[PDB]
């Protein structure tokens, strides 16, 4: 019962609502992450995995009605709905609060209400953007713990009254005495609400993921970005990846892809040419300022990997294998092997049984349903990954040479092209398509992530840019890892050989590689790219970085569809982009 009467007033008056059995403050300390454990081992919400094979690592199965996000649940409340807009779902911000406070009023009954104070970014900052949720859910504190600075140093660094984000959470599920809980307490209600003036945050009815973890999205995307947009910086959707060239050179890139797209192997990419190395700053959120000398610098504002386990691998991702290996891990949905390691679709191994996500019975080429959730996930610290530059935890973050966007795209967007210029970025940024059941666009990655209006965000991105040094700003690129040939067949290897594309990128920001200049941006050549050692068709690769302007006036309507979505707010430098790329078709 500490504080900074602010915090303190506020816990009370959260309390007075929710009615918990007690309030704890937590500290982040090792003592408590046990102590907390202990009890969800207790409730039944996590059992303690084979330490031999994870130290400190526990498993956890939600209900089958809590298993992700959800989108059609969360909600911008603005004053305005302009303010909110297009790809944004909004509610009248006292509609949204009288509804919520009533849904509030005696949540907790029967629960410990925990507040958690942490820090996003390196507690090293002098002004760290500081934030404290409360929960009554001890797996959010676990997670918490992870995934951001937690605890102690964070309450120390609020003073007697700094400023932070307000983020309430409950599951929804309250108890009476002597009631026996469940596992993994939900409700059927969700609403997870922002609150963009005041920089709160309000969460019901979830305790999964990006919902409940409230540092994960709700702060380091949706009110961050809304603080950038009123502070003149960017909070944005990107991995932070560090690139050492054979000179010994360290160049540093923040990229923005959709899901389904392979991010994560890239993050922690193993390239595949003598000389060049790779370390990772993180693989899911970059915040970028301008810096003293004019360039813009990232750090990472969180402080644990939250990773969708499917997919993930030892022959594709063995970095994030060690990372994983190395313990302290909470997994929620996945398999649980005989000998109490874990498994999930896609994980070498071929186990012969194992206790599926719903725990039950699952056999090797039999059972007909997913042994883990395809939403299935691991959360683990960054500082155990094999891989972590040691920039990682530096106040200052690390000069962002190029900014790279990317999606899945079977047809007409080349492997790799450079923007023209920033404005052209933005454009190429903004315009983000990847595949869906047939072109989804996602601008930046930041669809469902974004705190304000879409249009006026593309706005902020273009006022950074001009107000800014431009020979200092990052050069823009965009990646199509996926592109196909007639036949089906991938017209690039990926994977490691990105590492090729990515020495093509190095030398554009050094001057030392040309390219043709098309309609849509400066593409290479199959001769302008490292293939040596790599068996590939060069016939395939021309293929992958062809620019066809048939293919790519079919693509004119797509966009300017789209540009209608974004609306009135669409700043003229987009649709610029857009007539310019349209006369140089022709
Ligand atoms: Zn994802
Ligand atoms: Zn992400």
């Known amino acids: 019962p500490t504080n900074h009467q602010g915090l303190l007033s506020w816990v009370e008056e959260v309390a007075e609502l929710t009615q918990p059995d007690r309030v704890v403050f937590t500290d982040g300390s090792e003592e408590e992450f046990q102590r907390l454990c202990d009890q969800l081992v207790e409730a039944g919400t996590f059992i303690r995995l084979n330490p031999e094979k994870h130290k400190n690592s526990y498993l956890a199965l939600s209900d089958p009605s809590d298993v992700a996000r959800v989108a059609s649940r969360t909600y911008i409340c603005s004053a305005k709905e302009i303010d909110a807009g297009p790809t944004n779902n909004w509610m009248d911000p006292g509609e949204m609060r009288s509804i919520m406070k009533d849904l509030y009023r005696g949540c907790m009954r029967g629960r410990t209400m925990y507040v958690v104070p942490f820090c996003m970014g390196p507690l090293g900052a002098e002004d760290p953007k500081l934030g404290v949720e409360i929960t009554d859910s001890e797996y959010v504190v676990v997670s918490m713990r992870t995934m951001t600075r937690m605890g102690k140093a964070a309450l120390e660094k609020m003073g007697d009254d700094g400023f932070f984000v307000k983020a309430l959470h409950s599951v929804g599920a309250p108890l009476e005495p002597g009631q026996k809980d469940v596992a993994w307490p939900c409700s059927e209600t969700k609403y997870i609400t922002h609150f963009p003036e005041t920089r709160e945050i309000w969460s019901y009815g979830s305790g999964y993921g990006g919902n409940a973890l409230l540092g994960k999205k709700c702060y380091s995307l949706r009110i961050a970005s809304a603080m950038a947009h009123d502070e003149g910086w960017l909070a944005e959707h990107m991995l932070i990846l560090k690139l050492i060239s054979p000179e010994n050179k360290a160049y540093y890139f923040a990229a923005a892809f959709p899901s389904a797209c392979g991010k994560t192997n890239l993050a922690m990419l193993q390239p595949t040419i003598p000389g060049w190395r790779a370390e990772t700053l993180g693989d899911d959120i970059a915040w970028m300022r301008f810096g003293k000398d004019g360039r813009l610098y990232a750090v990472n504002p969180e402080f644990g990997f939250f990773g969708v386990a499917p997919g993930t691998n030892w022959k594709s991702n063995p970095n994030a294998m060690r990372t994983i290996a190395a313990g302290n891990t909470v997994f929620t949905n996945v398999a649980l092997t005989d000998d109490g390691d874990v498994w999930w679709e896609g994980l070498e191994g071929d186990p012969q049984h194992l206790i599926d996500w719903k725990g039950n019975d699952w056999y090797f080429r039999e059972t007909e349903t997913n042994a883990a959730h395809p939403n299935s996930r691991y959360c683990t610290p960054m500082s155990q990954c094999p891989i972590l530059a040691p920039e990682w935890d530096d106040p200052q973050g690390v000069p962002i040479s190029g900014i790279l966007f990317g999606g899945r795209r079977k047809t007409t967007v080349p492997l790799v092209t450079e923007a023209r210029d920033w404005q052209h970025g933005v454009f190429i940024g903004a315009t983000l398509g990847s595949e869906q059941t047939n072109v989804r666009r996602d601008p930046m990655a930041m669809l469902p992530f974004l705190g304000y209006n879409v249009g006026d965000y593309f706005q902020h991105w273009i006022n950074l840019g001009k107000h800014a040094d431009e ?59 490292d293939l040596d050692g790599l068996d590939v068709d060069a016939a395939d690769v021309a293929a992958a970085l062809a620019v066809d302007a048939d293919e790519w006036r079919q693509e004119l309507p797509l966009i300017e569809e789209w540009l209608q979505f974004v609306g009135e707010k669409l700043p003229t430098g987009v649709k610029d982009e857009f007539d310019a790329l349209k006369e140089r078709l022709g």
């Open 471 to 529: 020979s200092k700003l990052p050069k823009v690129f965009f990646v199509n890892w996926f592109r196909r040939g007639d036949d089906g067949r991938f017209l690039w290897p990926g994977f490691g050989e990105n590492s090729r594309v990515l020495k093509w990128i190095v030398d554009r920001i050094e001057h030392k590689a040309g390219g043709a200049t098309t309609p849509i941006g400066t593409v290479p050549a199959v001769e302008d790219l």
